[model samples]
Target: LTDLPGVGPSTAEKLVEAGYIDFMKIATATVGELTDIEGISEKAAAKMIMGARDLCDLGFKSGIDLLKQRSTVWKLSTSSSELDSVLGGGLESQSVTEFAGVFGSGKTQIMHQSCVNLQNPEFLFYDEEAVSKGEVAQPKAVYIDTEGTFRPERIMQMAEHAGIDGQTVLDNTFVARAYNSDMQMLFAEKIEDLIQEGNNIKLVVIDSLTSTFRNEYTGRGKLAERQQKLGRHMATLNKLADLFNCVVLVTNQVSAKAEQAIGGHIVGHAATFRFFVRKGKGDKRVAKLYDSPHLPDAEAIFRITEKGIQD
Candidate 1:
């Protein structure tokens, strides 16, 4: 970032201190945001931002060019084939995939299973023939649990059943607990520095995205303030997803209709893929594709066994 034309040692230092750790971050940042940092004047901030954007070619590109770039985006498969089928290939990179539902609808179960499955080196997307054998690994990993539902014992159980090493799975997975909306959003923003350090983390799962905001901000009067905060959270996550090639999975709690997840459009519109999960008879759980840019509307039935989500 110091290499950018207008950014000097002090400016870059302050910028880094303000969380602009990488070129892409500066490139995407608004002038208004940059000027908010102490010691950075409006004109200086604009010059720095323009310099970053120009260096990165943050301009238009041909569709074919982006189509070529798209090939690098990989999938992280869920253990269940049926579930993966509805997810196109699996939890896709470069966007957020939402799992919204009521309790016992299997959102947390799926999240746990995803973290465990990412440890398996054998679950590569090398061939369609290999799809039935196992699920693929997530790029890197972090699990943010807001509801205290993230349990190592459950991951171990899934590991044992899947024949993966339990201790190794536990060692590889990193979990953090966020107490409130501000902390949760801060953690998401902190992820940039984590990635900047070259940690191989590719997947980010927040067990319930809206729980803290829902609790912290109450009633009709605070609705606008709440949505503004929520929008920033989504924006930060979306930026990280695009810049880092991450496959983000966040759980959402439904509102009155049971089908409608909280956060209104702030959450709904920001999500690249929206999935609705619900409980079924026995251990069977249903996942319906609520929205996607390319994928079709479909549903998958899988069981939340003691081992993990299964066919």
Candidate 2:
């Protein structure tokens, strides 16, 4: 940043105080955020931003450019290597990834593992990738338990498998129970509060997205209203993904036999990636990619151990 021309050591200190540590992150940052900092006048802001862009040489450029940007995206991986390979790493930032399945198909397992690994991305030993995304300061995930899936000991169990302290994991995590969809909506919006305060909240998990909407507006006559309300809820979540540059991992409770998704077009379109998790032999579970054209149309097989998820 000091070599970037517009900033001296003091200006670099200013940027550090503002929480941006990556030169690449600067290119993606907006003018609005730059203006929020002290002493960064509009001219300096634009000057720094344009220089960053020029350095990027930069985008819409080609697949090579895409690769650079994609690698820079954070991946809070699962304990399972197979799962990470399937997700091209893990639950990624700046988008929503939906996991739908029957009762015991490991939706909660992935979510819990995410909460654990998010705090320690090197758990799987991807030190280089973790370094590029730039963690290992302090990080935490926001877990929203919709169907009473919040469990402290479960987190402890997975943390134990990854050789992380259960107490540290629990202490870093912030849990909220969403009794109804309205509460769920409120919780989603309140993340902006944490973001504004400059907290490193990189992941937001809704244990499942369908239950609350299913409870209300059940009959056929109100289905339209339900979908609209569901759409509104998704809109709030979608905004949060990019607003904080975080990962929004949601789940759905769909029928045992139906292949189609539970939500309407709005929900499907809003999600960048969609996964269908189902039982695969015994303790093994398979995660199928239903949407996400960029993702492979393949499956990830993982076992839910007593400690954590594994291949």
Candidate 3:
């Protein structure tokens, strides 16, 4: 429910499973239906329905209910179809995929390639290897350039390398420079708008989610504050991905200090799949999976080419 501020998909699903699938159903369902369900009580179900009506429009528990029942799995595209097979499909949409590394680690390069690749029949590669040359998916993309690194020229180079038309690249990807947490939230909401605008947006990217926070906030002195903010921020992205059925790729920077220990908790809780993008010589980059629901923990060697994402 929109008004019930914290009403999540899980709560909505409980209401549906109880047969009070709508405000109207809740209004009229027998006490038995509400009380008979596994965890819902009649009065609780009634309150939930009322809350749902107040926060959301009266309707069947269609949206969240369906999402809960269906598979939210996404294919992790390996810049190539063959690689998709190795990845169990391509990339998952209902979750966030994080690629972390130091400088020149090909994190940005992968983000750029994913942008060009995720526009289509609500699911087709618009610039399929960035080779479209000149075509528009009329799709939408959101790139929160926290590090001021989303250069149109560089994107064009990746596009041109992929054989895509230089000029047309900018015409599709929506780039936003997010310097702080508030700006990041605003930037993320744009993806929702894009979907509502009939763009069939397939992907959302946050290049270096931790850059500004790590810089602005500082050492262990601000650990609680930094982690809290980052955890909440990542949760928003996770919610958006599931709500919109879109792929989420966030590039994060590594903070591996031997003396202090490693592995922060923000991404650990928020991301469904985590990857460490290692630096490589020249055009090549090595990506190793850190965590995934179904994929194996293995290394994927990819590169940035004149054509976009390649192996």
Candidate 4:
């Protein structure tokens, strides 16, 4: 799509940022869909779509092309080897990984761990040269706290253990508090501004994605409307991940089934990967890989220490 005629660099950027990354998206788009973009004209949109169709031939590619496509994906380390192994090397970019469980099950704890991990010297070191070159600067984390769970004090503790400046770590992170369902949704929608401003956002954490929805939309009478809105919210997250090439991590609150079981279908196929976290014996917590595309269903044991999650 970027190679198409009449599609300037800014237009290309806008399209990709809008999740129309590939030619197929433009080629298959309706005039209304293409014109909905801020600056795209109907005539230009038609031409661009035709150009895209011409440029992107419907043909097969070699394994190397596939490999190159896969190479764009990156991992933000979890700082726990056991957890990393279960997660195929931490939460990956370009996908939404959901953590669901009851209270004290370490859902928010793991989110905090990710914040600290993103600030690790090693993780921050990779893009230094790129930053120096005026490219996308070092990656930063954006956390949307809807349940009053964003704790700077906890981040300071974990940053100390990681040997990073707590203040600097806090500075690099952007936190927003969403008091209601509308605010929560607005924050998610406006997160693109943060990503564009930073130019290199690696992680977006929505602590308790369902809390606002669950609270505002009650009873089976509004189930359909609630689920529809929830589905759109999930789609936005998915687009954010793909458009920015970042990790979208969401935490979910669960309701118990029967006989010590805990799960809910509210999220419903929105998460690219889903893990069920539970309390284990003693001081340990357990994470079970309930859903994924590549990884097998397995459990990983971890302890939430003062520093952070540990094997």
Q: Pick the candidate with the highest lDDT.
A: 1
lDDT of 3 by residue, 1-311 (tens): 32343335775677545433434444444557666766666666567556655544544668766654444344435475444544556767768888777778777877887776654233342223322323223555678888788877777776676566656757777888888867886778656566545665557899877777777678779888888888888877987776555678888876656211123777677888887776577877777776887778877777666666676
| Candidate 2: tens digits of C-alpha lDDT, residues 118-171 | 777564233354344444356767898888988899999999877889888898
Over the stretch 1-311, how does candidate 1's per-residue lDDT look in tens digits? 77887778998889888888778788888889999998988888888788888888878888776765666566777887887898888888779999998888989988888877777765434344422232233345788888888888998999999998787777876788988888788888888777667676777898789999989888879999999999999988888888886679999999774358888878988999998888899898899997999989999998999889888
Highest-TM-score candidate = 1
The candidate with the higher lDDT, 1 or 2, is 1
Candidate with the larger lDDT of 1 and 3:
1
> Weakest 10 consecutive residues, lDDT, candidate 3?
125-134
Candidate 2 lDDT score at position 236: 74
lDDT of 4: 0.78
- Which sections of candidate 2 miss by over 4 Å? 1-68, 123-136, 256-258
Candidate 3 Cα RMSD (Å): 9.7
Candidate 2: pairs in clash: none
Candidate 2 lDDT for residue 279: 96
Off by more than 4 A, model 1: 8-14, 35-44, 122-139
- Alpha-carbon shift of residue 287 in model 2 (angstroms): 0.9
Clashes of 2: 0
Candidate 3: segments with Cα more than 4 A from true spot: 1-76, 80-86, 120-138, 161-163, 258-263
Q: Using Cα atoms with residue i matched to residue i, what is each candidate's TM-score against the true structure?
A: 0.87, 0.76, 0.69, 0.83
Model 4 lDDT at residue 207: 91
* Candidate 1 residue 50 C-alpha distance from true site, Å: 3.3
